[PDB]
Design a protein around this ligand. Structure first.
Ligand code: MS4
Ligand code: MS4
Ligand code: ZN
Length: 257
């Protein structure tokens, strides 16, 4: 099945998932000088005070921190969004070296990693229904650069040893995603898709301008994860990012001057 290798990676996905070559694919390069400031964008509202994490898991593509989304406990609203989007999980994409790893790029610059906080439109009742809708999901993307450590990330990095290989999961309660946010909520936004199969074109992307800094030690621990299942030859979980896709008929809007 699909992956990030030479024989199953991004250039191959279109055979099983034709929408790979579709009209609103993600990620994209964000050209900062051509993005249009939009004064009609309401302020972004991130309400994670009641977020209830459950589990962390290695699915062979990334690691995933899963949340209890059975009530409106952690939601994203405002900005370009209509209605209420509920946090379901977060994951990251990262590189083998600090000069690559992000999926979105900013004037062609690649960051060391990118955080995706995934949310679904309540109006659709569940995630599975939401992904069949053009406004089904809102994914908050946050760039990571390597510099000072991110204290709020440490709890995640310390549990990664327990989910080394594909199919491993661990208890992961009481983790506060607010600890992963930068100071500014300035953002770019555009209509796009999931960056992995099934690549469904159901995402309103909200990408924050300001990166967070993580330490070399923190990102090194991401890179010790495995794509393989337990007992297989070790294949390091690195470079699990899709490259920038054609912008086609889309305008990227900016919340800031
Ligand atoms: N794939 C899928 C999927 C399909 C249906 C549902 C129903 N649902 C449950 N709660 C809200 N919706 C949830 C998921 C689902 C589960 C865990 C996840 O991590 C993500 Cl990103 C999605
Ligand atoms: N669809 C789906 C999905 C389902 C489950 C999980 C975690 N999981 C839980 N149990 C097993 N796996 C993650 C995703 C998932 C992956 C990539 C995505 O795309 S994206 N990168 O653009 O954020 C989006 Cl929007 C969602
Ligand atoms: Zn992602």
């Amino acid at each position: 099945h699909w992956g990030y290798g030479k024989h199953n990676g991004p250039e191959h996905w279109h055979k099983d998932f034709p929408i790979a070559k579709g009209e609103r694919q993600s990620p994209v390069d964000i050209d900062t000088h051509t993005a249009k400031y939009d004064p009609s964008l309401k302020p972004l509202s991130v309400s994670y005070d009641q977020a209830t994490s459950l589990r962390i898991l290695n699915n062979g593509h990334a690691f995933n921190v899963e949340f209890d989304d059975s009530q409106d406990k952690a939601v994203l609203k405002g900005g370009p969004l209509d209605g209420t989007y509920r946090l379901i999980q977060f994951h990251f994409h990262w590189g083998s070296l600090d000069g690559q790893g992000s999926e979105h790029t900013v004037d062609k610059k690649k960051y060391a990693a990118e955080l995706h906080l995934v949310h679904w439109n309540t109006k659709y009742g569940d995630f599975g229904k939401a992904v069949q809708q053009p406004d089904g999901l809102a994914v908050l993307g946050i760039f990571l650069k390597v510099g000072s450590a991110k204290p709020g990330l440490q709890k995640v990095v310390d549990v990664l040893d327990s989910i080394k290989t594909k199919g491993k999961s661990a208890d992961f309660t009481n983790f506060d995603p607010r600890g992963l946010l930068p100071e500014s909520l300035d953002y770019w936004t555009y209509p796009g898709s999931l960056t992995t199969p099934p690549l469904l074109e159901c995402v309103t992307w909200i990408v924050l301008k300001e990166p967070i800094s993580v330490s070399s030690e923190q990102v090194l621990k991401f890179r010790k994860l495995n794509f393989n299942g337990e007992g297989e030859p070790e294949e390091l979980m690195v470079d699990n990012w899709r490259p920038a896709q054609p912008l086609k008929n889309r305008q990227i809007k900016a919340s800031f001057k």
